[PDB]
Structure 1
Amino acid sequence: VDLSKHPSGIVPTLQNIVSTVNLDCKLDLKAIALQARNAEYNPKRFAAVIMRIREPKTTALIFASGKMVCTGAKSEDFSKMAARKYARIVQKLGFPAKFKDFKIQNIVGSCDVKFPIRLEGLAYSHAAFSSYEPELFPGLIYRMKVPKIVLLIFVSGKIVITGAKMRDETYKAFENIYPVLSEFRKI
């Protein structure tokens, strides 16, 4: 790992990317669910057609408005690439599908500092950013202000970082928290 960009020497692994794009045309969801083999639509439950492709492994939520949500990709590039594949399927189904305003909405990453954490102590010292009700959920919820990112910290040293729109925010949030986890290493 480049110790210069990642001083901790640990790089969070990207696990999930959520993006949206505007197909810029109205869609007939019922016609889409009928023609598209790997597409499901239950309006009474959710007003979108749920469609999936194997590569990049992702799930799309396609709306009558032409707007679309892409989930599951492991990278921003994989997410765009997946979103484009769905736009072409929709095009080939007979709709004038474009690719307007593609935007990465959320990036989810995770890593392991490989040492256990004293969550109770970190929670106490960082109370204005922490939420820890172990009887509820075993992880401490750390709502970082700069960058405005949320981290789920576990006793095992495993960390989830979410809410970023740029991978650098994910990286910086982790670099910020790293000395704090060290400060609260369970001995």
Structure 2
Amino acid sequence: SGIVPTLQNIVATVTLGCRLDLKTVALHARNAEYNPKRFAAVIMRIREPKTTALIFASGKMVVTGAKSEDDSKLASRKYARIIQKIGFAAKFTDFKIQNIVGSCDVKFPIRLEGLAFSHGTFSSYEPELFPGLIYRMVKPKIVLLIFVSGKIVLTGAKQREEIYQAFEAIYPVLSEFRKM
């Protein structure tokens, strides 16, 4: 065991607590994107940290695309200021971790069919559909996306250890349903 499921992404929503002018942000801001016919969301991205700001008409701004919690936070604080840089009285309010997407590798194929027959209470392999396996640990509430290549993808989390602590309790089962 002892494999850290590296967070492949971290999501975070921050509310500006205001109401911008969506056309105004499109014309004035530089790293901004917003299309009415598709979805009324401002597509704002900053090069450092490289995340995306899912800014809606109601000031709900989502920070996605970082790999760590604070990068998804640091980008947000930059995100709010650049909105303030437009000329609005935006405010960095209501920051929260939304989701932590993460994957790992075990370097050995796993008997997911073995995982499914004994741990079918917990396993789900769809070789015809999904080359991984969905192993949802209740405590912590983490889903282990368990691939035949060994890719154990973990997400549905806002706690960094929750991804980590769940794996430490699941590797022996993969060694149970391993080949070599």
Report the secondary structure of 2:43's partner residue: strand
- Between 125-134 and 22-31, the greater mean CA deviation after superposition: 125-134
Q: Which aligned pairs between 1:38-57 and structure 2 lie closer than 5 A? A: 38-57=31-50
For 2:69, which of 56, 72, 76 is the aligned residue? 76
- Is the contact between residue 22 and residue 67 of structure 1 (CA under 8 Å) also seen in structure 2? yes
Gaps of at least 5 residues in structure 2 are none
Shift of 1:131: 2.0
Q: Which residue of 1 aligns with 2:124?
A: 131
Counterpart amino acid of residue 160 in structure 1: V
Query: Runs of at least 4 residues of structure 1 off by over 2 A?
Result: none
Q: Which residue of 2 aligns with 1:86?
A: 79
- Between 124-133 and 16-25, the greater mean CA deviation after superposition: 124-133
Q: 1-side partners of 2:115 and 2:2: how far apart?
A: 22
For 1:66, which of 55, 59, 63 is the aligned residue? 59
For 2:22, which of 3, 22, 29 is the aligned residue? 29
Counterpart amino acid of residue 140 in structure 2: P
* Aligned residue pair count: 180
Q: 2-side partners of 1:9 and 1:131: how far apart?
A: 23
Counterpart amino acid of residue 49 in structure 1: V
Q: Which residue of 2 aligns with 1:168?
A: 161
Report the secondary structure of 1:139's partner residue: strand
- Is the contact between residue 15 and residue 109 of structure 1 (CA under 8 Å) also seen in structure 2? yes
Counterpart amino acid of residue 179 in structure 1: P
Q: 2-side partners of 1:156 and 1:137: how far apart?
A: 12
Q: 2-side partners of 1:179 and 1:79: how far apart?
A: 33
| Identity value in percent | 85
Shift of 1:43: 2.1
Q: TM-score, normalised by structure 2?
A: 0.95
Shift of 1:94: 1.1
Report the secondary structure of 1:138's partner residue: strand
Q: 1-side partners of 2:116 and 2:39: how far apart?
A: 38
1:185 aligned onto 2:174: no
Q: Which aligned pairs between 1:132-171 and structure 2 lie closer than 5 A? A: 132-171=125-164
- Is the contact between residue 112 and residue 123 of structure 2 (CA under 8 Å) also seen in structure 1? no
Tell me the C-alpha RMSD between the 2 structures.
Answer: 1.2
Shift of 1:130: 2.1
- Is the contact between residue 87 and residue 99 of structure 1 (CA under 8 Å) also seen in structure 2? yes
Q: 1-side partners of 2:126 and 2:149: how far apart?
A: 16
- Is the contact between residue 27 and residue 63 of structure 1 (CA under 8 Å) also seen in structure 2? no
- Between 76-85 and 93-102, the greater mean CA deviation after superposition: 93-102
Q: 1-side partners of 2:53 and 2:115: how far apart?
A: 38
1:96 aligned onto 2:89: yes
Q: TM-score, normalised by structure 1?
A: 0.92
Q: 2-side partners of 1:139 and 1:10: how far apart?
A: 18
